[PDB]
Amino acid sequence: MATLEKLMKAFESLKSF
């Protein structure tokens, strides 16, 4: 699989943005 950033950006860009 290859989508680590797609998994981290959600923990910060989702609502923490």
User: If you write DSSP's letter for every residue of 1-17 in order, what string do you get?
Assistant: ---SHHHHHHHHTSS--
In Å, what is the CA distance from 12 to each residue of 4, 9? Answer: 13, 5
Angle, CA of 16, 13 and 15, to the nearest 5°: 40
Q: How far apart are CA 16 and CA 10, in angstroms?
A: 9
The two tokens of residue 11 are 């923990």
Instruction: State the structure-solving technique.
Output: NMR
How far out from the chain centre does Cα 7 lie? 4
Q: Which two tokens stand for residue 13?
A: 């860009």
Residue 8: count other Cβ atoms within 10 Å of its Cβ: 10
Question: On the CB side of 16, how many CA atoms lie within 13 Å of its CA?
Answer: 6
Name the maximum alpha-carbon separation found in the chain. Answer: 26
